[PDB]
Design a protein around this ligand. Sequence first.
Ligand SMILES: C[C@H]1NCCc2ccccc21
Ligand SMILES: C[C@H]1NCCc2ccccc21
Ligand SMILES: [Ca+2]
Ligand SMILES: [Ca+2]
Lengths: 286, 286
Amino acid sequence: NLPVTVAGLGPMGSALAAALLDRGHDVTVWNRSPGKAAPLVAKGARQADDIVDAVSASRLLVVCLADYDALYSALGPAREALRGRVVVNLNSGTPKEANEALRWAERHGTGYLDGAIMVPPAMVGHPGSVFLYSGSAEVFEEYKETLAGLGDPVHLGTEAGLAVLYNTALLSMMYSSMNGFLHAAALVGSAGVPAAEFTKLAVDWFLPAVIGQIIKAEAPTIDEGVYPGDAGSLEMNVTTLKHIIGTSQEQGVDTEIPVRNKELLDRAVAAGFGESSYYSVIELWR
Amino acid sequence: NLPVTVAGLGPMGSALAAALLDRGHDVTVWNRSPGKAAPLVAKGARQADDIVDAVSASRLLVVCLADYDALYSALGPAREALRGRVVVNLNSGTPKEANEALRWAERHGTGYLDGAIMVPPAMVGHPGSVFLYSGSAEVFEEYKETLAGLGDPVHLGTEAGLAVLYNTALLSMMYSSMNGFLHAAALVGSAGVPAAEFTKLAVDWFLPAVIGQIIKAEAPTIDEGVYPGDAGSLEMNVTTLKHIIGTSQEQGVDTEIPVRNKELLDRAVAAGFGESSYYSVIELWR
Ligand SMILES: C[C@H]1NCCc2ccccc21
Ligand SMILES: C[C@H]1NCCc2ccccc21
Ligand SMILES: [Ca+2]
Ligand SMILES: [Ca+2]
């Protein structure tokens, strides 16, 4: 029974603590407010009312505070106790805040890893759960087996802000992809095709086999940064989008999604990228 | 040697004819303009200069005309010859144009299937190639084995415009998904992460395991059309997007993609959908 402390018992922190209890750890729990520990205590956790006692219980401190709270403030009273312990911070807001907390930790003689949880609380500890980490490689090596109880642990690198940045990036990709799916679903839905039908071709096939495979085939060319347009140019795609918009209007389906996508291309054609490949649109954003 | 005619020898039509030649068919080829047949004739094709002779050569007529041309016009001189033959049209512009051509075909005593080619010309006849079809089920059954030489054939239904509509829908989804990926790539790229590195997590894992699986899990709820927001509401996602925008600005990355995604949500919150789930945004578009 390897001791672990969880500081922060919102829905996410509580799921973390429950998962660690299920794996047989000696879990100490702390929260700014009383009343959130009882369900964890009923599962074998010990509540520590004072942060110093919670910090002192364990070398591994798993922190998941509310957004508006701050590690320096929650753990400030435990300054001295933090020396020689490790913070795994699972709720940094931004990359700069991760970097700030790493320096904070260093000043106290505390190891530091930042992590981003890629699943909802109910999925923590279950197959499918992935947690992205950044910061100390040594800390990661020390604790990866314990952290694998929470989700598949992936170390991105030493820069403290890489996990929050990846999370941010993947979510940005998710919002656009989901909108694209829903626009597509509205289009086939104008002909009576249910969304659950449409997913057989859109998700089981097109998403990985077409979108995903083209991204894989194109990514080294992106990194090269020339973007030749001989196999198909950015401006040719403005034509395809005009078509999509016209078909959408014939079907009585809203055109905001394809018109905004056409505007991203018009910006690029004004900047000089029309005869480059589609992927050159990324240069307006870097 | 099963005879097939290909009418239209642009890059796509030429790829179709080449694939059919590779499968051992007796291929007759026709094009409005001379000069595009020779590479196919060198592979075993017979050029027919007159459309009537091309139509009369085969029961199965695979049509892939230029966008600005029209089946009624290219095949008009072959009116009489078309009786008792079959048109597989692989280049309708819109769903209404597909439906028009089906009626056209019916008036002539000609079977009709509309198809949408989901791969580029170089991939026609190769593993990976998928062609979506709509129209006559009988025609499809008659010729699916021949059509499988071109790509995996999928019959969507009897309505003539379903394949063009699916194509339109899937492309709309592709443009948004690709933009999302490229915005994500720009975000991690601000920290020095190459796109080809980023795809290991973004495409091999996140795309299918997260985006795809959530769409599959959510699609029946979409079709139900209630969109309860108890597990997470649309307006909560406006918060996440504000976060993405703020992190993008801290990284020096353009915010157009997440700001436009936030605007789609603001439209929905103004229309009353804020406490519904994210997926309720589709109701503004249907
Ligand atoms: C599940 C929800 N939260 C994470 C990001 C996201 C993006 C698109 C649609 C829904 C959601
Ligand atoms: C490959 C190209 N043409 C088809 C649609 C599409 C959408 C996004 C990016 C590129 C392309
Ligand atoms: Ca409508
Ligand atoms: Ca920049």
